[PDB]
C-alpha cells in the first residue's frame, strides 16, 4: 500500500538525555532550527574535548544535536548550563539501536546529514573535529523517547548511493529478521530526504 509522508523526517528511538534540553514546553519537546549534527561513535567523558567544535557552533549562531553512545553526568551538566544561558543551543541523545546495527545507522544518519562520524578507529579525534565534520538538516525534533531529523542535508547521490548499499544486503540477507530490519533503515533514509 502507498504512504503520504513528504516531511516526517527520520526517526529513531532515543529520547532527549536532558529534560533541559526540552524548548517547547506545551508538548514536552526540543525543536531545533537548522541544527548542526556531532555523531561520535564513543561515550562523550569531558566536555573539553569538544570545545573546539562547540566554540566554533557557539560562533556560528545554530543549535547543535549530539548523537553519541552517552554523555557521562559531567560533560552533561556542562551542556545543560550553557544551553540554558544560551551560550550555545543543545541537545544531547543516544545513538540509535546496539552493537554492528549502531554503526551503520549512525552511519546513515551522517550520509543523510552530510556529516562524518567523528570515531578514533579511523583516526579520528574529537578534540580536532570541525564544522565540517558536522551534519545538518532542516530541522530537529526530540522528545522523551524520539528522535526525527528532518531534511537532511547530505547530497543526493551519496544517500542513494547508502540506500543502494542496503538493498545488496538484503538481497544478501539470510533472514527475514535482517531484510526487515535493513527494510527499516530505508524507511528511515526515506523520510529524512
Same mark, same amino acid.
Given at each position: 500500500?502507498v504512504?503520504t509522508?513528504?516531511?516526517?523526517?527520520? +526517526?529513531f528511538?532515543?529520547?532527549?538525555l536532558?529534560?533541559?534540553?526540552?524548548?517547547?514546553?506545551? /508538548?514536552?519537546?526540543? !525543536?531545533? %532550527?537548522?541544527?548542526?549534527? #556531532?555523531?561520535?561513535?564513543?561515550?562523550?567523558?569531558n566536555?573539553?574535548?569538544? #570545545?573546539?567544535?562547540?566554540?566554533?557552533?557557539?560562533?556560528?549562531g545554530?543549535?547543535l544535536?549530539?548523537?553519541?553512545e552517552?554523555? %557521562?553526568?559531567?560533560? #552533561?551538566?556542562?551542556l545543560?548550563? @550553557?544551553?540554558?544561558?544560551?551560550?550555545?543551543?543543545?541537545?544531547?541523545?543516544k545513538?540509535?539501536?546496539?552493537?554492528?546495527?549502531?554503526?551503520?545507522? =549512525?552511519?546513515?544518519?551522517?550520509?543523510? /546529514?552530510?556529516? /562524518?562520524?567523528?570515531?578514533?578507529?579511523?583516526?579520528?579525534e #574529537?578534540?580536532k573535529?570541525? =564544522?565540517e565534520? =558536522?551534519? +545538518?538538516?532542516?530541522?530537529?525534533?526530540? @522528545?522523551?523517547?524520539?528522535? /526525527?531529523?528532518?531534511?537532511? *542535508?547530505?547530497? %543526493?547521490?551519496?544517500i542513494?548511493?547508502? *540506500?543502494a +548499499?542496503?538493498?545488496? +544486503?538484503?538481497?544478501?540477507?539470510?533472514?527475514?529478521?535482517?531484510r !526487515?530490519?535493513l527494510?527499516?533503515?530505508?524507511?528511515?533514509?526515506?523520510?529524512?530526504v
Open positions: 500500500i504512504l509522508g513528504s516531511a516526517e523526517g527520520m +526517526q528511538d532515543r529520547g532527549y536532558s529534560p533541559y534540553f526540552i524548548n517547547k514546553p506545551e /508538548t514536552g519537546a526540543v !525543536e531545533l %532550527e537548522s541544527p548542526f549534527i #556531532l555523531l561520535a561513535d564513543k561515550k562523550i567523558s566536555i573539553r574535548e569538544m #570545545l573546539p567544535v562547540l566554540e566554533a557552533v557557539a560562533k556560528a545554530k543549535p544535536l549530539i548523537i553519541a552517552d554523555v %557521562e553526568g559531567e560533560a #552533561l551538566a556542562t545543560v548550563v @550553557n544551553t540554558m544561558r544560551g551560550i550555545v543551543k543543545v541537545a544531547a541523545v545513538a540509535p539501536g546496539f552493537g554492528d546495527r549502531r554503526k551503520a545507522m =549512525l552511519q546513515d544518519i551522517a550520509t543523510l /546529514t552530510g556529516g /562524518t562520524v567523528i570515531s578514533e578507529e579511523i583516526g579520528m #574529537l578534540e573535529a570541525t =564544522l565534520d =558536522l551534519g +545538518q538538516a532542516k530541522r530537529v525534533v526530540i @522528545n522523551k523517547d524520539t528522535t /526525527t531529523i528532518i531534511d537532511g *542535508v547530505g547530497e %543526493e547521490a551519496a542513494q548511493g547508502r *540506500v +548499499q542496503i538493498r545488496q +544486503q538484503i538481497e544478501e540477507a539470510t533472514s527475514d529478521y535482517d !526487515e530490519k527494510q527499516e533503515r530505508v524507511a528511515k533514509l526515506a523520510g529524512g
